[PDB]
Amino acid sequence: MPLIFKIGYNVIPLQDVILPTPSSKVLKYLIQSGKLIPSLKDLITSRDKYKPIFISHLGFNQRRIFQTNKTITKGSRLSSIIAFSTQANVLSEVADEGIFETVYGKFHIMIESIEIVEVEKLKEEVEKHMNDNIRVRFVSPTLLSSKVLLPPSLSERYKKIHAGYSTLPSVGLIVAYAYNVYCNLIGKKEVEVRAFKFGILSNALSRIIGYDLHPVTVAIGEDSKGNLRKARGVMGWIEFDIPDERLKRRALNYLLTSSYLGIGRSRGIGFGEIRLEFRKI
Amino acid sequence: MPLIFKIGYNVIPLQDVILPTPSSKVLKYLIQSGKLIPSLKDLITSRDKYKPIFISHLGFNQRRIFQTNKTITKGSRLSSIIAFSTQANVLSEVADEGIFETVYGKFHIMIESIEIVEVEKLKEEVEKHMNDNIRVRFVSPTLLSSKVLLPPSLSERYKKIHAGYSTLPSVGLIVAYAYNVYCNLIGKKEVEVRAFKFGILSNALSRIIGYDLHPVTVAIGEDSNLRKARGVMGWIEFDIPDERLKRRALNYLLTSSYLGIGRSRGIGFGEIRLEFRKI
RNA sequence: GCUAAUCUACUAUAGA
């Protein structure tokens, strides 16, 4: 019943431009003004935990434009991806092959790809990867709060203290996040304990085969006057396996969903973009 | 009245020699034959979980001799470190040294350092690092079993499956290991659950600041076959915003700074260096 | 640039 649309955009600037932080802001404007698919306003303004919307950074060459600082200054073939779920017909809108104008300047947007999938059909994919090593690549700065794997019982005890991010991703944190997102996506509540136990159990019984990670500092804007805001997250890749069949299946399932909506905080602004890959033994 | 001896050795080979795997075996020999501190023999032969003994690999320069993915010359300054605890009268034997002869060949052993600390005086040090970022450097391949942070309830459920090592050091996993080793050091049982909770909680309330880690594969011999395993090396810098947790953690960590971390410290794995940063 | 990981009388979340 619920399903995900992942649309691949081609964005070209006409003049030379300095992109804001984060770079996804441009497209947000197109939504926040009802220039591109307005039926997302609520979703883009939403403050609900683990909301099912992902608006990626633009990416030049085979990379997503890193921030922390400066400019592109050149009309070129930029890339974008937007992923989401909701009962509102997106197929009615989309289109748009001409140019648009923002407070950030003039852009020409196109569509390169359309992918639509129903979340229950991805369970079909899972079975063909039950003998693969799972490699998760963080193609954008990924922010994983540690408290996510805190026992729900002590939630109020440490409710005030902000422990910050685990810039070193455990398997359990990744699958716990994937689970939370999946869960909010398919409209299942009171799930804290299932999430907690899933994460703990998963990284207690996971085998980490290889990895190449690096901590990065991400800038996320100013707001309001006169501040300036910025976090620490992770980038790179990680390859692991879960010898338990049931655990592996659940994990693969949730992970496939995150392969569209992203992982960790705060996917709503382009963070936590991931690519899923596999290897045979 | 528990305490730790850490002795720093200077090892020179006399002939051209090929080191065994692991290289710590050389020093291990001096104990299993009563050439060095014989009162440790049983400890080297012991199979007790988290025994308080660490006998490091040999090392040329600041680095520890990595293994067959060779041979050292007639004269070469190798280094060694051994740390331990026990109530068995060793107090004398420590000093011991000279030119000993082993099945790996003939060596000249010296002493370039001797440190003794009692675990009770360490907590004072704790108090001055209560505002520091804690940096743990793995100067040798460190093996961290993931099941350490498995809920003790399901211990029997998965007693057979061997999940292997987490080559990705969790803050909670390393402090859990530190806790277990410390606990065994001071003679405490029923720790499984306290350890579990400690690790889970610390991993939930930790902030990881920076790191440079890389997975490595180490070989440990054959006997029949060929033995090998996967661990981690590099460094990791973190902080724990909770006072009680940070206190406990630093405490256990100081001990692991002598006895090593994870398994199996008895043969040179999990050698760590503890460092700090002021904020 | 390198990226699967192992033997044992299960103390095996151990010891080598």
Add this chain to the structure above:
RNA sequence: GCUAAUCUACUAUAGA
């Protein structure tokens, strides 16, 4: 070569 990281309607294990 480089390794601290935060603003808010505490939905804050969130959203930007």
